[PDB]
Amino acid sequence: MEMPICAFQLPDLTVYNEDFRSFIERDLIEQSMLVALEQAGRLNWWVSVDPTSQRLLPLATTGDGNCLLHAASLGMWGFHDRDLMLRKALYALMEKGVEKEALKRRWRWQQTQQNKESGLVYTEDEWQKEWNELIKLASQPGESLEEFHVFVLAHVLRRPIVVVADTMLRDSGGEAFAPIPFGGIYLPLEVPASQCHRSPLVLAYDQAHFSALVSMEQKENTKEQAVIPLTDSEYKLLPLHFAVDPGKGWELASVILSLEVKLHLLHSYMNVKWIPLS
Template identity: 40%
Template sequence: NVDADQQQPGGNNLEAERRLRQLRRSADWRWLNACVGIIEGDPNPVEAYLSSGGDPARTLTASEVAILNRSSAFDVGHTLVHLAIRFQREDLLAVLLSQIEGSGSGVKRVPSYVAPDIAADIRRHFASTIRLRKGNFPCNFVTEFPTFSLPADVDELPSTVQDQLFTELLDKDAQAELESDPAVINWSLDVTLRLGSRLYALWNRSAGDCLLDSVMQATWGVFDRDNTLRRALAESLAEGGHVFYPRWKEYEQGHASFLQYSLDETQWEEDWNGLISLAGQPGTSLEQLHVFALAHILRRPIIVYGVKYVKSFRGEAIGYARYEGVYLPLLWEQSFCVRTPIALGYTRGHFSALVPIEPYRPVDGRSPPGPDHARTTFLPLVDRDRKMLPIHFLTESELGREESILRQWLDVCETEGGILVAQQLLNKRPLIVAQMVEEWLNHYRRLAQMTAPFRPIPIQDYSSEGDTDDE
């Protein structure tokens, strides 16, 4: 009996191993590799699973947990979303949520996902460019001013590959809403065709960080994953609040009186404190004041093209959206700021970076004088009815001088069709951003090579009679 008792565990182990081998043979390894990819931070097996039609809401079974054999990481009933949250894989979580939410965005392949290590270096570099201004207006500011654009090489890709690139890069829902009648972007053929200044809405994370993500994408081409820009924003409003507050209050009082209501000082201070609190909480949506403050941190204008009315999911107008317009760093000296703006789009509760495809050559057709020559795109300062975009947070004494103020802070000109536009200079990309863009673009170049039609080698290549004219 003793011998039998001693042999029993070994027999059980052999049986368990045999059963495990059977389970492994019949397992869906594309799904299991995606689970492992989440905890290891590797997007490739996750994208392979989703691209093959895998269900992002699929749950792990007991037998699959046994195969993976990592009880500290995997539990029965876990989905990819559970794993992404547990192991703080924010980029992968955004991809999964974009599919589950049914936004039609599918698998996303933005530059920072294709080159995550370079993107992390860019975020670290950005953090090193932030300084705090001393003196009467303690506000954070940046020391570098890149403007992100899509490379001109995108236009050289085959149409099928180009379509895939745009599907995986853009927020097609936001693009459609911004371009639908009445359009708020790309409504002028004068601007989009003659001046080559079409704008594209980049996809970003949707969990309350979209304003900060879109500002980072419009400048450095990455998300605010480390909350660096959010911290700079919260600190600036807390430290420089005594300078921001009077202008904010006067602006809001103007709106309140227009709507025939008023607040006492206690209520104004409560609203102000609420806005400061929002700035410091990752994942919380931000307001107009925060856009205004970000223009000061960036030391440059921000132009927001937005829907005029917020609509319900049934398409009914449920409120007026005030975001569209120009946000100038009015509290700085003009000499401390740059005149090249960035552009953002605003749809229902969501911000997107609006970026152009860089032009091959200047609009006038002349050759650039050197490699650092800035190419130019043009951003309308009027809506499709030729009504000037509002400048937010002007004081009463500044009202009525809007066009003059725009010309003080931006390089303003008119198109041949008489449209008032701001010039956006696209300087040479910072090297680290260029490396990320190149790595991202190489993915689609390889796709183009794989999908190119097969060309048989001419038979003359194998002849021994030397070269021919045909070759």
């Protein structure tokens, strides 16, 4: 049976790259995240079924910046305020710019589907208020960020984002409590693929924390490229976030159509490679 994967790498600085990679090499790993995601079977499940894959490890966050932005701003190493600058761009994109209306429709459309699970129906005023809170979160430095913010971040970077995560929050008893929304693939769908980077930013999420993932080969600067699967451990294609703008049209036939569209979108924005399961 076949499975889709894609290569990824750390940014390459045009100056002081050696210094940057030295800080990466001396970086600590987020042990609690590694332990939790590996035990839950979400991280590094591929190591056994694909001999040429690498164990991936979450880098610990440094500084005062938000963990997501810090993980995503490694290409701006050397600039102290890189996290703050990235936040301004994420906020600017939601508040201004050409794609803000389409981004908002994608958010509302997905949230609308989610609302149906609870028999909840937002008024227009409630939609505006919920949107305002998303803007406020993006505007305030140090504030934590939601699933949609990750989607907008993919557009700021003009690069696909892949998040490794568990699917369910569970209680003290160990029983499932509520879904985790972060795991999956975030494409810059409002950005023409011709203007996008194809190699993904690869992250992991656990316990309200985001971390950049690297192999030991990448961390020690012995090899540039690592690989990440585009399926879960059951070989189901990872969820595609905010994939539908109703402003661009919308509809086993329904499910299979969603599957083919996903494959075509991955092909448009990513360099997918298919390998046999060993």
